[PDB]
Design a binder for this molecule. Structure first.
Ligand SMILES: Cc1cc2c(cc1C)N(C[C@H](O)[C@H](O)[C@H](O)COP(=O)(O)OP(=O)(O)OC[C@H]1O[C@@H](n3cnc4c(N)ncnc43)[C@H](O)[C@@H]1O)c1[nH]c(=O)[nH]c(=O)c1N2
Ligand SMILES: Cc1cc2c(cc1C)N(C[C@H](O)[C@H](O)[C@H](O)COP(=O)(O)OP(=O)(O)OC[C@H]1O[C@@H](n3cnc4c(N)ncnc43)[C@H](O)[C@@H]1O)c1[nH]c(=O)[nH]c(=O)c1N2
Ligand SMILES: O=c1ccn([C@@H]2O[C@H](COP(=O)(O)OP(=O)(O)O[C@H]3O[C@H](CO)[C@@H](O)[C@H](O)[C@H]3O)[C@@H](O)[C@H]2O)c(=O)[nH]1
Ligand SMILES: O=c1ccn([C@@H]2O[C@H](COP(=O)(O)OP(=O)(O)O[C@H]3O[C@H](CO)[C@@H](O)[C@H](O)[C@H]3O)[C@@H](O)[C@H]2O)c(=O)[nH]1
Ligand code: NA
Ligand code: NA
Lengths: 386, 386
């Protein structure tokens, strides 16, 4: 055959499945991608004026405590020692972030020892018992009190979900969001970095194999019947939109989206930190990314006097807009459960597997997706190709 | 012979010289150490109540951009991903540190962009031209202005050197101490961590070799004539006090010292950061070290409800007191230059080499010492043992 496996999509999920099949089974794998680039939403490319790497589908920071995934992805790229950190902009002052002794000192006026700070939160959050809460506004206040809630959460949350906190489930926060030390790593995980020569280089390396064929700029639904004709019992992995596979026969799945406003400024340094959250409602966007800071080890290939930055906005996502975050209304999660039924049928009837962010209506971190792929590979695909 | 090389001292300098001679030349090396422990001032040991590693000769953070040294020391111990960070305590508020957009925001009331902040420092430091300064107080103010100087430098400096800034050379600061971003790594170097099983374990590994013999609790001047008798043209490396070698025949070298006040507290967490500087004169000590935080990856072998901390004080150092920092008065640096003459004579007449912190009256970082040793090894010792 020309191929033994067809993979729809070239996000981390497709790529992984693909590469395993190529290197571990030695099969011929054909990757079909709609866009003109490899990588799915993880893709990054250089801004033309400045040369600086940016991400046209949202900023991507790689982090995992999953050693399996880590050793794996390191097979295809090295990482930097980048540790992600964030600052929160509120009333013209940049606060340390997330919530901890640092922010606490800046906001309530003076230093609180760890023990002091636990107590400070005790009194503040005493208003509502977490067992009481009816919506998102309460449940937070019940965890950290009104002063903090109103300053750092209320508007930020509102902007991100286009809504009032009072009209959101209480179940969306599940943990005390406060640290009683000065540690402001944003992420708790074992391993963390950025791909050394960027994501594009990395993603691309995953498909650079003597058994993988990649057709960019190709829609699967336009070429499916043709390709399956060439070798009919070659199986498919579909990482595209779940609902669309089944021609929305059952209602459109509901997604949240993002609009990105990307400017080049005539300064070498606009905020001196990669990410700057904006928590006051006076501003449309949720945060400003300044991309040079993600790779400071490159700042000798960077513009002395220019910098690229990007403002992130949120809204609901519909048609033509890129889907980013599943919304998961109740009326979404059953039309899902339903499509599951369809997919399984379709998986047994016609050897077509469903995976990844779009393919399962589900938020996935990068390592999550990669693992999800590796699961499917080992559990479903090894026997499916014998 | 029983030994081919005698090494006085077991600090990093001795150890290095020793280990190279043992592993690269295969010589028999006898290490003579006055204290009862291996390691010199780098040594660390567990506080008995809590089990927590501490440093009885000052806190030690390892950091280098010298790859040679790095690959070397990794031969004897692994390091953690510890990045050192510091906070400055001034008027009951803990400031981000060192001086940068962060501290700046906290102190002058609101966020300053990088460009804004450069300008802010322009006006502040405009008072005195750096070309003018007569003492340490001016030279700082000429670099960062009075508001900052007085808040974060004046008292801290005074405590550390027991003096008024106005009576210190202008040459002790040589660089703008301000960052125009939010990056608060304390150290600029390529590599940085803490020894995984502590320094004691590490240091000790360097002497664990089938050609190295270690006699703890032995003063060299008490046993020298004896040992050199056993094999008279076996050479010595002396890493002890330079002046004392030559029986202070030429004036006592002047050192600064430290007194450490070490307490165990009945709390799991006293300040939630490894180091907390204290910049106001209301406090005797310069900073408080809280040692559990140096190894957070151990906090599941740490006391749930106790923590060891330590307050650091400075003064001048004399006899019986441990020497820490060369003072380098003018009347010190010529009595030095002189002892150099003596040493070289003594090096040619009697094959006795002088090295390391004490042996050269000179502040040395760990990697500096190690490199200094490696220099001496390759340049003077290889031919000296043929
Ligand atoms: C804003 C934002 C930011 C981040 C993240 C998500 C979001 C939304 N993620 C990273 C990322 O979005 C996610 O992990 C991956 O995109 C999932 O990879 P997939 O293969 O599952 O989907 P992905 O969407 O990447 O791949 C799908 C591919 O299929 C193609 N395709 C679709 N329909 C097709 C059709 N009909 N025919 C052919 N091709 C078709 C698409 O063109 C696309 O290339 C993340 N995770 C993390 O761990 N850390 C982070 O910091 C971030 N950052
Ligand atoms: C407070 C403080 C903090 C730090 C540092 C210094 C100070 C003062 N240094 C680390 C350290 O102090 C320095 O790098 C080493 O001690 C130098 O190693 P040496 O072998 O040169 O001397 P060192 O003093 O360690 O070794 C001398 C040894 O010789 C022995 N001795 C002396 N006289 C003798 C005699 N007559 N006979 C026999 N034995 C004798 C002593 O007992 C001792 O064991 C540092 N560096 C860095 O890179 N990062 C850091 O964070 C720090 N931290
Ligand atoms: O300043 C802040 C930050 C967060 N939040 C709340 O916490 C949530 C966290 O969202 P956000 O800070 O915007 O994004 P992350 O937590 O960094 O990441 C989200 O998106 C990432 C990439 O898209 C995924 O890796 C994460 O799982 C997902 O939580 C927000 O919706 C808010 O409800 C605030 O109120 N204020
Ligand atoms: O809060 C601060 C910190 C520093 N300084 C000034 O900067 C100097 C720096 O000294 P200090 O902060 O006490 O120590 P380090 O810079 O961390 O380290 C000193 O001691 C270390 C270990 O002993 C060595 O690695 C360094 O080379 C040596 O500069 C001080 O004397 C002051 O003059 C201030 O004014 N305020
Ligand atoms: Na409560
Ligand atoms: Na000036």
């Amino acid at each position: 055959s020309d191929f033994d496996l067809i993979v729809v999509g070239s996000g981390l999920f497709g790529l992984t499945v693909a590469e395993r099949a190529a290197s571990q089974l030695g099969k011929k794998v054909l990757i079909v991608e709609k866009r003109s680039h490899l990588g799915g939403n993880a893709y990054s490319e250089a801004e033309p004026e400045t040369g600086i790497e940016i991400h046209k589908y949202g900023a991507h920071l790689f982090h995992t405590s999953n050693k399996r995934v880590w050793d794996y992805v390191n097979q295809f790229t090295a990482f930097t020692g980048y540790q992600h950190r964030v600052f929160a902009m509120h009333n013209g002052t940049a606060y340390q972030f997330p919530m901890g002794l640092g922010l606490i000192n800046q906001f309530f006026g003076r230093y609180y020892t760890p023990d002091e700070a636990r107590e400070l939160i005790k009194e503040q959050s005493a208003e509502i018992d977490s067992k009481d809460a009816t919506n998102l506004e309460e449940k937070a206040i019940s965890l950290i009190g009104r002063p903090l809630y109103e300053a750092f959460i209320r508007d930020y949350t509102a902007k991100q979900w286009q809504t009032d906190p009072k009209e959101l489930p209480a179940g969306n926060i599940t943990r005390l969001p406060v640290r009683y030390n000065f540690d402001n790593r944003y992420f708790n995980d074992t391993y963390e970095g950025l791909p050394v020569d960027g994501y594009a280089q990395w993603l691309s390396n995953m498909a650079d194999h003597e058994n993988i064929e990649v057709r960019l700029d190709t829609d699967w639904f336009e070429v499916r019947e043709d390709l399956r004709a060439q070798n009919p019992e070659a199986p498919v992995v579909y990482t595209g939109p779940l609902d669309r596979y089944f021609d929305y026969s059952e209602g459109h799945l509901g997604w949240r989206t993002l609009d990105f406003e990307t400017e080049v400024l005539n300064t070498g340094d606009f905020q001196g930190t990669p990410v700057m959250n904006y928590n006051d409602a006076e501003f449309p966007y949720t945060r400003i990314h300044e991309f040079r800071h993600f790779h400071p080890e490159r700042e000798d290939r960077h513009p002395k006097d220019k910098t690229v930055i990007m403002k992130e906005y949120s809204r609901f996502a519909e048609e033509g807009d890129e889907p980013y975050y599943p919304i998961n209304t109740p009326s979404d999660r059953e039309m899902l459960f339903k499509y599951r039924e369809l997919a399984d049928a379709e998986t047994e009837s016609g050897k077509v597997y469903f995976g990844g962010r779009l393919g399962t209506y589900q938020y996935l971190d990068m390592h999550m997706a990669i693992a999800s792929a590796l699961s499917m590979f080992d559990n479903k695909l090894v026997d499916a190709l014998k």
